Amino acid sequence: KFGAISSVLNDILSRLDPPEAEVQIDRLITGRLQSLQTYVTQQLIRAA
Amino acid sequence: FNATRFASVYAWNRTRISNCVADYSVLYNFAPFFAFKCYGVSPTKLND
């Protein structure tokens, strides 16, 4: 969840008002991108 | 909603709603709403 109300985007889009949904949406994006960055960095080290 | 002896706050009445189909239009038209602050879900899309 990374601190949001739920981990399913389809669930959190039909359970909140659009002006407030963005706050919970803009946590999944950052968690996913940090996970992706960690993955790519370890992959670069392994490739070296 | 059409009760006559809503219990006091010190001993709040609790009812269980299950095995039915919910259409909150009756809830809308059976009260001159003064405060409808819904938190976990948007009141607009409440019937799906």
Ligand SMILES: *[C@@H]1O[C@H](CO)[C@@H](O)[C@H](O)[C@H]1NC(C)=O
């Ligand atoms: C039920 O609702 C109607 C419409 O507001 C009202 O006239 C009636 O008194 C209510 N019945 C009870 C038992 O409160």
